[PDB]
Design a protein around this ligand. Sequence first.
Ligand SMILES: [Zn+2]
Length: 357
Amino acid sequence: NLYFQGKERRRAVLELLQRPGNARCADCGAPDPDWASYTLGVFICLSCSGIHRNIPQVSKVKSVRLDAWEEAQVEFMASHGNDAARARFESKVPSFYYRPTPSDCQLLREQWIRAKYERQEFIYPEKQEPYSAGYREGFLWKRGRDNGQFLSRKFVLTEREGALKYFNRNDAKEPKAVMKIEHLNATFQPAKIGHPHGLQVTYLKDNSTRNIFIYHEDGKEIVDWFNALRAARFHYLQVAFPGASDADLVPKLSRNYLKEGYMEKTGFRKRWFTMDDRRLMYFKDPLDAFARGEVFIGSKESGYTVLHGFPPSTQGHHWPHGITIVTPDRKFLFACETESDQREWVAAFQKAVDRPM
Ligand SMILES: [Zn+2]
């Protein structure tokens, strides 16, 4: 009964999706993947399948449900799969190495797939040296301090000195800037930086917060920089926090910002705000080289409250939608342009409020 034959082959491959090990995209972790690399033997989301197609000499994809399958292809998935791929392709992933989520930028999702399956960095660990050696140097494009032009500059990350440094566009032996690892936070910001490989590096200098904005033409190179920076952070935290587990530390290597955007602050004046964990920073503009100031936001239990609207007898022209933050010592007033802005900011603030000290 050929109908039964066809049906059985179809339900065989579907049943593989219905294995717990295959319940999430192999690459980004999105639930319920619908596609497959029948050459890598993994189940993946639509988005990751699109990336896989761009490495055709490595990965060939089909829809699990909507494409025709050969017995041997189904058999290959059955002998392989996502657990198998974890053991094979993620065998030697360093603890510091950033693993992308579905909301990450394309660069990170793409480079993850390439690192695992193309370059096979976690099968052959000598390939990990760019981000594992505690020393890395190379050229990067850096946004001008006070202008929008990028200049190519030599950067050096040196664990021995606990710093990232760059140099002038000259022969000089002494760096232009030294950025200490202890308070360095690197996040990818392609939208903001206006380059798909745009990396923001934010650090503490002379008890003030500073930003640089850099990129490399090559996706691999920038992502190597990023992971090198994480390595340095990790090795730092390990020293700083004896007895802390890997899991304790890894979430601290770098931190995406809870929320960023324009708000008005007390007259009222528009500033670009950035919520970094418990630290609400502001700037004149997103590409400002320095923080103009900062507000700390502790726990509800520590006397912090987030309230909607403005207090009675608030005066001025402002944006319509107010937020008040009550601290044990002070009051902070903000005005948001829109309600969704307000809702968004309220929630970010509340995240800090709701989290114990
Ligand atoms: Zn995916």
